[PDB]
Amino acid sequence: TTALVCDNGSGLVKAGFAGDDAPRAVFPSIVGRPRHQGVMVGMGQKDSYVGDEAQSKRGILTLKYPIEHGIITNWDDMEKIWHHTFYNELRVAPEEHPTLLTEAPLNPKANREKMTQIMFETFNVPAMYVAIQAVLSLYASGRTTGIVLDSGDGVTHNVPIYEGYALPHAIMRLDLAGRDLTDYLMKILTERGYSFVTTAEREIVRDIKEKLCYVALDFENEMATAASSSSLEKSYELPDGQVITIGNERFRCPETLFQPSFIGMESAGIHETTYNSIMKCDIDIRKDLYANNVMSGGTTMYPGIADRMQKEITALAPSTMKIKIIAPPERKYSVWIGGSILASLSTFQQMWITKQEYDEAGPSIVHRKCF
């Protein structure tokens, strides 16, 4: 039958049918539990709101994210996320549909074990698969080779691919993405006096980060321009009607991607991670990689990140050699778009992990059948 692609990303879940270009079900992955005292009688209100329902009623809820840095912490919450995205949102029986899944590189293996166990026992499917997100992000681009910087909500990872072949020794992982940028923006918004402490206000700071922030092409010139004149200041309207204004915090927040020492972590920026990933490959296979930097992830939707990435790589690299940053405008759903491309192929139909094969091999064939 028609396959399902469910990128269960760290901040937003993108689920939909195979063969389509637009994901039918994009919704953030949160669990909203009540914290105040109910006085109304007649039920209707649940003990846990999941998805857009928790987003609408977020002012009376404690929000819990089931995924932290690409690792599922609360398995019951993530099970509720799977139940909501299968039965309530997409409205399909899982036991008549194959279902591709996505996972970050260098993950703990027992996390993959428990994903395979829950997906084969509770939400039992005829077939499923676990695949690297960067591979499917390259599969959206319509090319065979290139390096993918995928910066999600929990994991920013660099994976090179050469002639459709991942090099696992050159893959690196970096725990700096959109949730950490939201936390740093929540920290630096207290300079102007705008206090944000609740989990409900974290979504508002995330909305400010989505709507107003951008990557500075040159950091020190944007410091000079922001300190000189109030031309870069932009106003935002809160849901309670208060209008705030932010200045340099539009570009001091994504610069943590290029300067992680703002949030105290020792490791270098994403450009140096990409550059070290390319020297971790061999010398002759670098020729495609500089020509095929294909970004993905929602964190790469800032409208200054491609020119900055080209500038930083062209500064680091030898200049004998073409730098090309291939950023499609639909790079948020490129994991799901690549999944819908891959799941609609006959050659993939022999590579499914299935029920009976799981029954002989235990929940450990996902370490063998899936790379």
């Binding site: 022999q350 299935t354 009976q356 094969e357």
Partner: peptide, 10 residues
Amino acid sequence: ERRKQQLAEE
């Protein structure tokens, strides 16, 4: 053969 029986079952 197990994969062929699998794809015939499914």
